[PDB]
Protein backbone atom coordinates (compact mmCIF):
# COMPACT_ATOMS: atom_id res chain seq x y z
CA UNK A 1 0.00 0.00 0.00
CA UNK A 2 2.09 2.88 -1.33
CA UNK A 3 1.47 6.64 -1.56
CA UNK A 4 -1.16 8.24 -3.79
CA UNK A 5 0.30 9.98 -6.87
CA UNK A 6 0.13 13.77 -7.18
CA UNK A 7 0.49 16.38 -9.92
CA UNK A 8 1.12 20.12 -10.00
CA UNK A 9 -2.06 22.13 -10.65
CA UNK A 10 -0.11 24.49 -12.91
CA UNK A 11 2.67 24.15 -15.53
CA UNK A 12 2.37 20.37 -15.24
CA UNK A 13 3.73 19.55 -18.72
CA UNK A 14 6.05 22.46 -19.55
CA UNK A 15 9.16 20.22 -19.60
CA UNK A 16 7.58 17.30 -21.48
CA UNK A 17 7.08 19.43 -24.64
CA UNK A 18 10.53 21.01 -24.48
CA UNK A 19 13.59 19.64 -26.20
CA UNK A 20 15.65 17.19 -24.19
CA UNK A 21 18.62 19.56 -24.08
CA UNK A 22 16.60 21.89 -21.85
CA UNK A 23 16.10 19.64 -18.82
CA UNK A 24 18.72 16.92 -19.38
CA UNK A 25 21.50 18.61 -17.40
CA UNK A 26 23.64 15.46 -17.16
CA UNK A 27 24.34 15.59 -20.89
CA UNK A 28 25.14 19.30 -20.75
CA UNK A 29 28.71 20.17 -21.74
CA UNK A 30 30.18 23.00 -19.67
CA UNK A 31 32.04 25.73 -21.60
CA UNK A 32 34.81 27.46 -19.59
CA UNK A 33 35.64 31.16 -19.59
CA UNK A 34 38.89 32.86 -18.58
CA UNK A 35 39.53 32.73 -14.82
CA UNK A 36 42.10 35.52 -15.16
CA UNK A 37 39.22 37.89 -15.89
CA UNK A 38 38.24 37.78 -12.25
CA UNK A 39 39.89 38.67 -8.95
CA UNK A 40 38.40 38.23 -5.51
CA UNK A 41 37.70 41.42 -3.57
CA UNK A 42 35.96 40.27 -0.39
CA UNK A 43 34.30 37.13 0.96
CA UNK A 44 30.55 37.25 1.49
CA UNK A 45 28.65 35.89 4.48
CA UNK A 46 26.68 33.34 2.49
CA UNK A 47 26.38 29.57 2.85
CA UNK A 48 29.80 29.50 4.54
CA UNK A 49 30.37 26.25 2.69
CA UNK A 50 30.57 26.32 -1.09
CA UNK A 51 32.01 29.77 -0.65
CA UNK A 52 30.90 33.03 -2.28
CA UNK A 53 32.96 36.20 -2.87
CA UNK A 54 32.51 39.77 -4.09
CA UNK A 55 34.84 40.10 -7.05
CA UNK A 56 35.90 42.36 -9.89
CA UNK A 57 36.10 41.75 -13.62
CA UNK A 58 39.46 43.44 -14.21
CA UNK A 59 38.94 43.52 -17.99
CA UNK A 60 36.17 46.12 -17.65
CA UNK A 61 36.17 46.95 -13.93
CA UNK A 62 32.63 45.68 -13.42
CA UNK A 63 31.73 44.25 -10.02
CA UNK A 64 30.72 40.58 -10.03
CA UNK A 65 29.94 37.80 -7.57
CA UNK A 66 31.99 34.59 -7.64
CA UNK A 67 30.74 31.28 -6.25
CA UNK A 68 33.47 28.65 -5.93
CA UNK A 69 31.92 25.21 -5.92
CA UNK A 70 33.91 23.11 -3.41
CA UNK A 71 33.54 20.11 -3.03
CA UNK A 72 32.62 18.91 -6.49
CA UNK A 73 29.76 16.62 -7.27
CA UNK A 74 29.66 17.10 -11.04
CA UNK A 75 25.99 16.25 -11.48
CA UNK A 76 24.75 18.87 -9.00
CA UNK A 77 26.97 21.48 -10.66
CA UNK A 78 25.60 20.85 -14.16
CA UNK A 79 22.07 21.03 -12.76
CA UNK A 80 22.60 24.48 -11.23
CA UNK A 81 24.40 25.67 -14.36
CA UNK A 82 21.67 24.42 -16.70
CA UNK A 83 18.92 25.95 -14.57
CA UNK A 84 20.76 29.28 -14.33
CA UNK A 85 21.22 29.35 -18.12
CA UNK A 86 17.60 28.35 -18.76
CA UNK A 87 16.29 31.14 -16.52
CA UNK A 88 18.80 33.82 -17.52
CA UNK A 89 17.11 37.12 -18.40
CA UNK A 90 13.94 36.16 -16.54
CA UNK A 91 12.17 38.54 -14.13
CA UNK A 92 14.01 38.90 -10.80
CA UNK A 93 16.32 35.95 -11.50
CA UNK A 94 20.03 36.30 -10.68
CA UNK A 95 22.13 36.49 -13.86
CA UNK A 96 24.91 33.97 -14.48
CA UNK A 97 27.67 35.89 -16.27
CA UNK A 98 30.44 33.30 -16.72
CA UNK A 99 31.77 29.87 -15.77
CA UNK A 100 35.44 29.31 -14.95
CA UNK A 101 37.69 26.70 -13.34
CA UNK A 102 41.07 26.52 -11.62
CA UNK A 103 43.48 24.97 -14.16
CA UNK A 104 45.33 23.19 -11.33
CA UNK A 105 42.70 21.95 -8.87
CA UNK A 106 39.96 21.79 -11.55
CA UNK A 107 37.65 23.46 -9.02
CA UNK A 108 34.81 25.20 -10.94
CA UNK A 109 33.25 28.55 -10.12
CA UNK A 110 30.17 30.49 -11.20
CA UNK A 111 30.36 34.22 -11.93
CA UNK A 112 27.24 36.29 -11.40
CA UNK A 113 26.35 39.84 -12.43
CA UNK A 114 26.69 42.13 -9.41
CA UNK A 115 23.88 42.35 -6.96
CA UNK A 116 23.49 44.54 -3.90
CA UNK A 117 24.26 42.25 -1.04
CA UNK A 118 21.47 43.06 1.29
CA UNK A 119 19.12 40.08 1.82
CA UNK A 120 15.39 40.24 2.65
CA UNK A 121 16.26 39.15 6.25
CA UNK A 122 18.35 42.30 6.85
CA UNK A 123 15.83 44.57 5.11
CA UNK A 124 12.42 43.44 6.47
CA UNK A 125 12.39 44.90 10.01
CA UNK A 126 12.57 48.44 8.57
CA UNK A 127 9.93 47.95 5.84
CA UNK A 128 6.42 49.40 5.98
CA UNK A 129 3.33 47.30 5.30
CA UNK A 130 3.31 48.34 1.63
CA UNK A 131 7.00 47.50 1.02
CA UNK A 132 6.54 43.95 2.30
CA UNK A 133 3.64 43.50 -0.13
CA UNK A 134 5.72 45.06 -2.91
CA UNK A 135 8.70 42.75 -2.39
CA UNK A 136 6.51 39.70 -1.80
CA UNK A 137 4.91 40.46 -5.16
CA UNK A 138 8.36 40.73 -6.74
CA UNK A 139 9.29 37.32 -5.34
CA UNK A 140 6.10 35.89 -6.86
CA UNK A 141 7.23 37.30 -10.21
CA UNK A 142 10.40 35.22 -9.95
CA UNK A 143 8.62 32.08 -8.74
CA UNK A 144 5.86 32.18 -11.34
CA UNK A 145 8.55 32.57 -13.98
CA UNK A 146 10.78 29.70 -12.81
CA UNK A 147 7.75 27.47 -12.24
CA UNK A 148 6.54 28.31 -15.75
CA UNK A 149 10.01 27.31 -16.91
CA UNK A 150 9.54 23.88 -15.30
CA UNK A 151 11.80 24.55 -12.33
CA UNK A 152 11.22 24.42 -8.58
CA UNK A 153 13.63 26.49 -6.48
CA UNK A 154 13.42 24.31 -3.35
CA UNK A 155 15.35 26.73 -1.14
CA UNK A 156 13.15 29.79 -0.73
CA UNK A 157 14.12 31.79 2.37
CA UNK A 158 15.00 35.42 3.27
CA UNK A 159 18.74 34.76 2.78
CA UNK A 160 18.11 33.86 -0.86
CA UNK A 161 16.24 37.04 -1.72
CA UNK A 162 18.63 39.88 -2.55
CA UNK A 163 17.11 43.36 -2.44
CA UNK A 164 18.56 46.68 -3.56
CA UNK A 165 16.06 48.84 -1.65
CA UNK A 166 17.47 52.05 -3.12
CA UNK A 167 16.55 50.99 -6.66
CA UNK A 168 13.69 48.77 -5.44
CA UNK A 169 15.16 45.81 -7.30
CA UNK A 170 14.99 42.18 -6.18
CA UNK A 171 16.81 38.99 -7.19
CA UNK A 172 16.12 35.38 -6.26
CA UNK A 173 19.48 33.66 -5.80
CA UNK A 174 21.14 30.32 -4.96
CA UNK A 175 19.65 27.83 -7.39
CA UNK A 176 21.94 25.06 -6.12
CA UNK A 177 18.99 23.02 -4.83
CA UNK A 178 16.68 23.82 -7.73
CA UNK A 179 15.29 20.98 -9.86
CA UNK A 180 13.24 20.39 -13.00
CA UNK A 181 9.66 19.33 -12.41
CA UNK A 182 8.50 16.25 -14.28
CA UNK A 183 4.93 15.06 -13.60
CA UNK A 184 5.03 11.78 -11.67
CA UNK A 185 8.70 11.99 -10.71
CA UNK A 186 9.73 11.24 -7.12
CA UNK A 187 12.23 13.68 -5.65
CA UNK A 188 14.67 13.73 -2.73
CA UNK A 189 12.99 15.34 0.29
CA UNK A 190 16.29 16.48 1.80
CA UNK A 191 16.03 19.98 0.34
CA UNK A 192 15.32 23.52 1.62
CA UNK A 193 16.29 24.95 5.00
CA UNK A 194 14.72 23.28 8.04
CA UNK A 195 12.53 26.25 8.95
CA UNK A 196 11.15 26.43 5.41
CA UNK A 197 10.63 22.74 4.69
CA UNK A 198 7.10 21.90 3.59
CA UNK A 199 5.15 19.17 5.42
CA UNK A 200 5.60 16.98 2.31
CA UNK A 201 9.36 16.99 2.95
CA UNK A 202 8.94 16.35 6.67
CA UNK A 203 6.60 13.37 6.25
CA UNK A 204 8.72 12.06 3.35
CA UNK A 205 6.29 12.47 0.45
CA UNK A 206 8.46 12.43 -2.68
CA UNK A 207 6.03 13.29 -5.48
CA UNK A 208 6.01 17.01 -4.68
CA UNK A 209 6.07 20.01 -7.03
CA UNK A 210 6.28 23.81 -7.38
CA UNK A 211 3.89 24.14 -4.43
CA UNK A 212 6.85 23.41 -2.15
CA UNK A 213 8.14 26.92 -2.88
CA UNK A 214 4.75 28.36 -1.94
CA UNK A 215 4.92 26.84 1.54
CA UNK A 216 8.40 28.31 1.98
CA UNK A 217 7.09 31.69 0.85
CA UNK A 218 4.31 31.36 3.42
CA UNK A 219 6.89 30.80 6.16
CA UNK A 220 8.70 33.97 5.08
CA UNK A 221 5.52 36.04 5.07
CA UNK A 222 4.45 34.77 8.48
CA UNK A 223 7.81 35.66 10.03
CA UNK A 224 7.65 39.18 8.60
CA UNK A 225 4.07 40.22 9.39
CA UNK A 226 4.23 38.65 12.86
CA UNK A 227 7.85 39.65 13.54
CA UNK A 228 8.84 36.12 14.56
CA UNK A 229 11.84 34.82 12.66
CA UNK A 230 11.76 32.06 11.79
CA UNK A 231 8.03 31.42 12.28
CA UNK A 232 8.25 27.64 12.63
CA UNK A 233 11.38 27.20 14.74
CA UNK A 234 12.17 23.49 15.06
CA UNK A 235 15.39 22.12 16.53
CA UNK A 236 15.42 19.25 14.04
CA UNK A 237 13.39 17.83 11.15
CA UNK A 238 11.12 15.90 13.53
CA UNK A 239 10.53 18.84 15.86
CA UNK A 240 9.95 21.03 12.82
CA UNK A 241 6.75 19.12 12.01
CA UNK A 242 5.76 19.39 15.68
CA UNK A 243 6.14 23.19 15.50
CA UNK A 244 3.87 23.23 12.45
CA UNK A 245 1.33 20.89 14.04
CA UNK A 246 1.06 23.18 17.08
CA UNK A 247 -0.24 25.87 14.72
CA UNK A 248 -2.11 24.09 11.90
CA UNK A 249 -3.41 21.34 14.19
CA UNK A 250 -2.95 17.57 14.09
CA UNK A 251 -6.37 16.76 12.63
CA UNK A 252 -5.60 18.28 9.22
CA UNK A 253 -2.15 16.72 9.38
CA UNK A 254 -3.57 13.22 9.69
CA UNK A 255 -6.18 14.06 7.03
CA UNK A 256 -3.25 14.94 4.77
CA UNK A 257 -1.37 11.74 5.58
CA UNK A 258 -4.53 9.71 4.93
CA UNK A 259 -5.34 11.49 1.67
CA UNK A 260 -2.00 10.61 0.09
CA UNK A 261 -1.63 7.29 1.93
CA UNK A 262 1.65 8.46 3.47
CA UNK A 263 3.56 6.16 5.82
CA UNK A 264 4.64 8.38 8.72
CA UNK A 265 7.97 7.68 10.44
CA UNK A 266 6.94 5.87 13.64
CA UNK A 267 9.17 8.23 15.65
CA UNK A 268 6.50 10.89 15.16
CA UNK A 269 4.04 8.85 17.23
CA UNK A 270 5.42 9.93 20.61
CA UNK A 271 6.20 13.57 19.76
CA UNK A 272 3.33 14.80 17.60
CA UNK A 273 0.62 14.61 20.25
CA UNK A 274 -2.75 16.21 19.67
CA UNK A 275 -3.10 19.91 18.91
CA UNK A 276 -6.01 22.12 17.89
CA UNK A 277 -5.72 24.46 14.92
CA UNK A 278 -4.71 27.92 16.11
CA UNK A 279 -6.43 31.00 14.68
CA UNK A 280 -3.94 33.32 12.97
CA UNK A 281 -5.11 36.20 15.15
CA UNK A 282 -3.34 34.57 18.12
CA UNK A 283 0.03 35.66 16.74
CA UNK A 284 -0.99 39.32 16.43
CA UNK A 285 0.30 41.84 18.96
CA UNK A 286 1.14 45.51 19.52
CA UNK A 287 4.56 45.28 17.87
CA UNK A 288 3.35 43.64 14.66
CA UNK A 289 -0.23 44.88 14.30
CA UNK A 290 0.63 47.53 11.69
CA UNK A 291 1.80 44.76 9.35
CA UNK A 292 -1.32 42.62 9.76
CA UNK A 293 -4.61 42.96 7.89
CA UNK A 294 -7.56 40.69 7.06
CA UNK A 295 -6.07 40.31 3.57
CA UNK A 296 -2.65 39.30 4.91
CA UNK A 297 -4.15 36.67 7.20
CA UNK A 298 -6.38 35.26 4.45
CA UNK A 299 -3.42 35.20 2.05
CA UNK A 300 -1.25 33.49 4.67
CA UNK A 301 -4.02 30.98 5.41
CA UNK A 302 -4.10 29.92 1.75
CA UNK A 303 -0.34 29.35 1.62
CA UNK A 304 0.35 27.47 4.86
CA UNK A 305 -1.63 24.28 4.29
CA UNK A 306 -0.51 20.67 4.77
CA UNK A 307 -2.03 19.60 1.45
CA UNK A 308 0.38 20.94 -1.18
CA UNK A 309 -2.33 20.76 -3.86
CA UNK A 310 -4.60 23.14 -1.93
CA UNK A 311 -1.99 25.90 -1.58
CA UNK A 312 -2.21 28.91 -3.89
CA UNK A 313 -0.01 28.73 -6.96
CA UNK A 314 2.34 31.66 -7.62
CA UNK A 315 -0.08 33.03 -10.22
CA UNK A 316 -3.13 32.65 -7.98
CA UNK A 317 -1.14 34.38 -5.23
CA UNK A 318 -0.50 37.43 -7.41
CA UNK A 319 -4.27 37.81 -7.86
CA UNK A 320 -4.97 37.85 -4.12
CA UNK A 321 -6.53 41.04 -2.62
CA UNK A 322 -3.36 41.37 -0.50
CA UNK A 323 -1.63 42.75 -3.61
CA UNK A 324 -4.46 44.95 -4.97
CA UNK A 325 -2.75 48.28 -4.23
CA UNK A 326 0.63 47.03 -5.49
CA UNK A 327 -0.86 45.88 -8.81
CA UNK A 328 -2.83 49.13 -9.16
CA UNK A 329 0.31 51.21 -8.58
CA UNK A 330 2.26 49.10 -11.08
CA UNK A 331 -0.10 50.14 -13.87
Amino acid sequence: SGPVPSRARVYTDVNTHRPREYWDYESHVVEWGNQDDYQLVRKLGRGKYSEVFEAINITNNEKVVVKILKPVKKKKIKREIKILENLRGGPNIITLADIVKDPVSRTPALVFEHVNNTDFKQLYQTLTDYDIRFYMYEILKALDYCHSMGIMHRDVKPHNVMIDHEHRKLRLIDWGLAEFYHPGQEYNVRVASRYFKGPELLVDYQMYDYSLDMWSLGCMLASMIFRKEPFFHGHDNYDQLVRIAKVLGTEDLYDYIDKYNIELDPRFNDILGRHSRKRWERFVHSENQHLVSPEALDFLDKLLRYDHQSRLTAREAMEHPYFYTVVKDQA
Partner: peptide
Protein backbone atom coordinates in the same frame (compact mmCIF):
# COMPACT_ATOMS: atom_id res chain seq x y z
CA UNK B 1 50.28 33.33 -1.76
CA UNK B 2 47.85 35.59 -3.60
CA UNK B 3 45.84 32.80 -5.23
CA UNK B 4 42.58 31.28 -4.00
CA UNK B 5 41.24 28.33 -5.99
CA UNK B 6 42.98 29.75 -9.05
CA UNK B 7 41.69 33.29 -8.54
CA UNK B 8 44.15 36.07 -7.83
CA UNK B 9 43.22 38.14 -4.79
CA UNK B 10 42.53 41.71 -5.94
CA UNK B 11 45.44 43.94 -4.94
CA UNK B 12 47.43 41.16 -3.29
CA UNK B 13 51.24 41.07 -3.32
Amino acid sequence: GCRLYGFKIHGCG
